[PDB]
From a paper:
The particles harbour 10-separate genome segments and comprise two principle protein layers, the innermost composed of 120 copies of protein λ1 clamped together by 150 copies of σ2 (viral polymerases, λ3, are attached inside adjacent to the icosahedral fivefold axes). The outer layer consists of 600 copies each of μ1 and σ3. The array of μ1 and σ3 is interrupted at the fivefold axes by pentameric λ2 turrets which enzymatically cap the mRNA transcripts produced by the polymerase on egress from the particle.
The star shaped icosahedral particles comprise 120 major proteins with additional density features on the outside. Since the 60 copies each of the A and B molecules account for the large majority of the density for these particles we henceforth term them single-layered particles (SLPs). Due to the radically different configurations of the SLP and virion-like particle the contacts between the molecules differ markedly between the two particles. If the A molecule is considered fixed then the change corresponds to a 45° rotation around a pivot helix in B, with the effect that a bundle of helices surrounding the pivot helix rotate by a register of one helix (~12 Å), analogous to gears slipping by one tooth. The density is poorly defined and only the region fairly close to the λ1 shell is seen, so it is not possible to unambiguously assign it to a particular protein however the overlap between the positions of these features and the attachment points of σ2 in the virus suggests that they are σ27. There are no significant sites of unexplained density in the interior of the λ1 layer of the SLP that might be attributed to the λ3 polymerase.
Residue numbers in the entry:
A (entry chain C): 217 to 562, 571 to 1275
B (entry chain B): 410 to 505
C (entry chain B): 266 to 313
């Protein structure tokens, strides 16, 4: 099972398997290079993020301590531990077991403990104090927290086997067996109803009251293996929110699911019939192959890729290098320039050229690089060093310059540069100056002007543009060369590529299924001969040789030659023209076949723009991309794209090496092309990473849509988006602030998927407020092409809205305290909590004589016996006593000063001040009621923790719960909340039979409605008001075949 | 940015002053090690000297020439007696 | 141009209430705070 790619060849007993490098057995096998997150996971542990914590057990009358069978006794174990007070605690996937970790788990501390870290998980992380969070960052933190919870819950629950039960209550009933130990503890949790309750306690009474039928497996898939079915429905404690999110994730997987037969056909198409994958496969009942995708996602991803590339030449060189290595071992053709030397059998012009050649170097990267550039036509430019051209424009009499000219002429058709023909023509004119005359339309450009200066169409000469305009008499050799170039100028080609049904193609500036080539290609024929003038390159070489012979015929261009080298020169040129190189033949047939095979092989889709060999007006000048919608107007800023002025990155390669290779090509004598290609391709195909790249791209696309939606959700934009937590505090963040929060979300996502590769970095690069991505390019004549893709929606956003509404309903359960609190020391024997104290004791907001103070309100202080009364906001000076309303923002502005003014009032003052809080995180401390309590020191510490930048979670001191009368001692507390937030407490004092008055909490019937209420149907929901802690759930077992191919011949 | 701690006309005036008109107004950049050719920001300053510097910049821009142009001119002036060369790359903003 | 302080404000006094004493806070100010202050031209006074 270690193998993730399994390939078996039909023509050899040598199966080749591709696996993740993390495996311990990479023996003679391909491995998966792309960094890819494992979206699909199987859960071996409970998917539970919340566990109730019981503060102190309460039990009263009890029928039995252990079930009696023979001399043995079955022990009674409560899945819920007994408590005077019990509250659930947050630890996402606390009971889960899996090999892969999302690394996004959230643990919230128990009520006696501080959970501030989760609240401060985002912007509040940088706090020296464990407690304390910045308020305006709270909304962003909550949103990110929900996002992390969802990412952490991206798992699939693996279907598992069941067992007949021998416990008496469900003896013979089938219980799914949890792994190894605690299974009975796990059984008690899944089937508390199974656990007996002979003892009397609120838990026991509740268990006795529970319905017997609402337990065990609700239903199973008819197909099953042993005790395990493909899917099953069972009754157990669970959280609906996670199940619903997983259902949405599963639905995405179901849409993505792809079929094996389609894969076999696609693999055959990619092989181009060189190799074919076989599927005589026994069907997997749960076989799962999620490979459904849209080319629009690919287009968005490629736009992201270009922005991410940000012109990194460093990234490009390695891909080209790996491709060249592949071409070097993917081509059976052998290059022998030394064979050319032996055929020459060599003051010698041949010796001069041989010394210039310096053939000792054994590296052939440039030719392979040239092919790769042809593949990426739009983003690649081939350029030639002027030094490759003859020095000083060459010399009419220079034989070495003649060698340079011949090599240059050979590689000139090869150059992708559009104005390269103009440059070669200019180069010939430069050598011809003083022998043939060329008119110049522009004074700025001279006949001797360096051709490289003419790098653009607008600089193409009108005399150059019309051959007839130039006098044939003025430059007859040049006139002939122009006619010959028109007669034999090379033809570029376009070839069909890609499979639309699955991978498809995202091509926009080019046809999606068509691959552009700068070289016309013809059908491969193994029997083809070495000599072929029909091949464009062979014809070009022959014409160039004859033209040069004609030029050197009179020796007018080379006066001062005592002996005629015309005969010798003609012979050497004739041998060169007639050289039986197979390199052109290979480029004509073998090169196209290899390129066609590698096109699917390419991990990154090449960028190309339409080829216009002679269409100067329709030659595109540049490509523009936009992050904003057309209507919006925004500042243009410095960007990476500027570093490449050319849309195609300019590349200079060694002309001599390429020309020598072109003159020196031979295949193996007994080579079988089909055999060689199938043998090389089979391991290479077994090495495919395209699926991994596609998966990463799809994740990036989903992330982009989710990000734009979230940006609208947490920012003020024209588009309407539902935000029900605007009450949650937030300031108006600058675009940069939102971007930084977004970058933290991105880092979280990468760690969640364990991504070792950069993700959406161009998206995090800048311009976070980008209305719309759009791209266009224009021609020299000025015609332009604009491509804009359409946004596909993100499931994450919909799940987020649902969770947001759930949080708004359950924020008290969520652990954040909405509302404000009032400051008043109170000592009493009543149990009223700060959440639920006597209301009359709190001065209500709509109360007369309460004091609000103006920011500039006149302030008076008394020293050395002075007595001051503060002038009020109304302007009436009053003593520092009574009920006052203080805005928190004013307090943060003057926290130290306010504390100092009321420090005496705070410690012993009866003056009561209300600071408006709206919402805040809170901290809970249990205390002993029968001992004296003073929070004044504690209140001082909390106030000191309060700071102008941000405030600490409110510290609450609460008594230990009691089911029986207990003695009490005075307790002093100055913190009074304005509302009850005790809904979080699961139960109180299970032992007590009944309560005449005051607070009492029991196990919630609604959360256990299916067990508590027989009438209620199992699938009936109380959401969002009531979330059942225990519910019937569906667990399914599926099997996923990763890339697998059986390679054979075509029928 | 100064704390008000006063009812001074200055304190009232600061409260009156627009909160959002602060920080860089705009810049010609975003990439790391990619300096903005120009940047706009709200700040305490005097408009007249800024206007003078802008006119000075306008005259300098009026005389500015591109490096490729310089290479061609120098090569022509050398007349092949000597050769000067420039590499091919986008303007990085060098005033000529 | 730089503002120069001409006449400062008068403080401190026993009668003056000091919950308020602004001088007690002593916050650095963008402009001179004084009974009389006038702008002055100092070309490149802060320039480097």
């Amino acid at each position: 099972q270690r193998h993730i790619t399994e390939f078996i060849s039909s023509w050899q007993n040598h199966p080749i398997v591709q696996v993740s490098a993390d495996v311990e057995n990479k023996k003679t096998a391909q491995l998966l290079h792309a960094d890819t997150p494992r979206l699909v996971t199987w859960d071996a542990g409970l998917c539970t993020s919340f566990k109730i914590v019981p503060i102190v057990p309460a039990q009263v009358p009890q029928d039995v301590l252990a079930y009696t069978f023979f001399t043995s006794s079955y022990a009674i174990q409560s899945p819920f531990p007994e408590a005077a007070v019990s509250r659930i605690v947050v630890h996402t996937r606390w009971a889960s077991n899996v090999d892969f970790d999302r690394d996004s788990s959230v643990i919230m501390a128990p009520p006696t403990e501080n959970n501030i870290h989760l609240f401060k998980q985002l912007l509040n992380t940088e706090t020296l104090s464990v407690r304390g969070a910045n308020p305006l960052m709270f909304r962003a933190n909550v949103l990110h927290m929900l996002l992390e919870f969802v990412l952490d819950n991206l798992y699939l629950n693996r279907h598992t086997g069941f067992s007949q039960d021998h416990t008496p209550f469900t003896e013979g009933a089938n219980l799914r067996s949890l792994p190894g130990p605690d299974a009975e503890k796990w059984y008690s949790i899944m089937y508390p109803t199974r656990m007996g309750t002979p003892n009397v306690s609120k838990i026991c009474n509740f268990v006795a009251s529970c319905v017997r039928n609402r337990v065990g497996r609700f239903d199973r898939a008819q197909m099953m293996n042993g005790a395990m079915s493909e899917w099953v429905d069972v009754f157990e404690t669970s959280d609906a929110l996670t199940v619903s999110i997983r259902g949405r994730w599963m639905a995405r997987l179901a849409r993505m699911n792809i079929n094996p037969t389609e894969i076999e056909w696609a693999l055959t198409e990619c092989a181009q019939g060189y190799v074919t994958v076989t599927s005589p496969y026994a069907p997997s009942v749960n076989r799962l192959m999620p490979y459904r995708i849209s080319n629009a996602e690919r287009q968005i991803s490629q736009i992201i890729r270009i922005m991410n590339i940000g012109n990194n030449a460093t990234v490009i060189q390695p891909v080209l290098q790996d491709i060249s290595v592949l071409l070097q071992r993917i081509s059976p053709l052998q290059i022998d320039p030394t064979i050319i030397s032996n055929t020459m059998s060599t003051l010698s012009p041949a010796s001069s050229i041989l010394g210039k050649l310096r053939p000792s170097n054994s590296d052939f990267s440039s030719f392979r690089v040239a092919l790769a550039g042809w593949l990426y036509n739009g983003v690649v430019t081939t350029v030639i060093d002027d030094s490759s051209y003859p020095k000083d424009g060459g010399s009419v009499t220079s034989l070495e310059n003649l060698w340079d000219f011949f090599i240059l002429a050979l590689a000139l058709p090869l150059t992708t540069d559009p104005c390269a023909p103009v440059k070669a023509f200019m180069t010939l004119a430069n050598m011809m100056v003083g022998f043939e005359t060329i008119p110049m339309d522009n004074q700025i450009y001279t006949q001797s002007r360096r051709a490289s200066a003419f790098s653009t169409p607008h600089t193409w000469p009108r005399c150059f543009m019309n051959i007839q305009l130039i006098s044939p008499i003025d430059a007859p050799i040049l006139r002939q060369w122009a006619e010959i170039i028109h007669r034999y100028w090379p033809n570029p080609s376009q070839i069909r590529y890609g499979a639309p049904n699955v991978f498809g193609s995202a091509n926009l500036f080019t046809p999606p299924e068509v691959l552009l080539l700068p070289i016309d290609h013809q059908p491969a024929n193994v029997t083809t001969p070495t000599l072929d003038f029909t091949n464009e390159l062979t014809n070009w070489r022959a014409r160039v040789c004859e033209l040069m012979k004609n030029l050197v015929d009179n020796q007018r261009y080379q006066p001062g030659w005592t002996q005629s080298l015309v005969s010798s020169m003609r012979g050497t040129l004739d041998k060169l023209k007639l050289i039986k190189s197979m390199t052109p033949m290979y480029l004509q047939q073998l090169a196209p076949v290899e390129l066609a095979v590698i096109a699917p092989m390419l991990p990154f889709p090449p960028f190309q723009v339409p080829y216009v060999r002679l269409d100067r007006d329709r030659v595109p000048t540049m490509v523009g991309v936009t992050r904003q919608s057309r209507d919006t107007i925004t500042q243009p800023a410095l960007s990476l794209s500027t570093t490449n002025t050319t849309v195609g990155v300019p590349l200079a390669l060694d002309a001599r090496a390429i020309t020598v290779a072109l003159l020196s090509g031979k295949y193996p004598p007994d080579l079988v092309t089909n055999v060689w290609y199938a043998d090389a391709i089979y391991p290479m195909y077994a090495d495919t990473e395209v699926f991994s790249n596609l998966q990463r791209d799809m994740i990036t696309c989903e992330a982009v849509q989710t990000l734009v939606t979230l940006v609208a959700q947490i920012s003020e934009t024209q588009y309407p988006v539902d935000r029900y937590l605007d009450w949650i505090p937030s300031l108006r963040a600058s675009a940069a602030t939102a971007a930084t929060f977004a970058e933290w979300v991105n880092t979280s996502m990468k760690t969640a998927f364990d991504l070792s590769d950069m993700l959406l970095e161009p998206l995090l690069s800048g311009d976070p407020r980008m209305t719309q991505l759009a791209i266009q390019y224009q021609q020299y004549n000025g015609r332009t092409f604009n491509v804009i893709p359409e946004m596909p929606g993100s499931v994450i956003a919909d799940c987020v809205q649902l969770t947001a509404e759930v949080f708004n309903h359950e924020y008290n359960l969520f652990g954040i305290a909405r509302g404000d609190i009032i400051i008043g020391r109170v000592q009493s024997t009543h149990l009223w909590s700060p959440l639920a104290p006597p209301p009359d004791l709190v001065f209500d907001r709509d109360t007369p004589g309460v004091h609000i103070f103006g920011r500039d309100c006149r302030i008076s202080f008394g020293m050395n016996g002075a007595a001051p009364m503060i002038r009020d906001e109304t302007g009436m000076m009053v003593p520092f006593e009574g009920n006052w309303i203080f805005p928190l923002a004013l307090w943060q502005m003057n926290t130290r000063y306010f504390n100092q003014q009321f420090d005496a009032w705070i410690k012993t003052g009866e003056l009561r001040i209300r600071i408006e809080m709206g919402a805040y995180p809170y901290m809970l401390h249990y205390y002993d009621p029968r001992q004296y309590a003073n929070a004044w020191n504690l209140t001082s510490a909390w106030l000191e923790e309060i700071t102008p930048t941000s405030i600490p979670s409110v510290p609450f001191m609460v008594p230990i719960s009691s089911d029986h009368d207990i003695s009490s001692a005075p307790a002093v507390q100055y913190i009074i909340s304005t509302e009850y937030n005790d809904r979080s407490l699961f139960c109180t004092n299970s032992s007590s039979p009944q309560t005449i008055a005051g607070p009492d909490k029991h196990i919630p019937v609604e959360r256990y409605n299916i067990l508590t209420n027989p009438d209620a149907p199992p699938t009936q929901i109380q959401l969002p008001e009531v979330v059942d802690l225990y519910n019937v759930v569906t667990r399914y077992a599926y099997e996923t075949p990763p890339i697998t191919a059986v390679v054979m011949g075509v029928p």
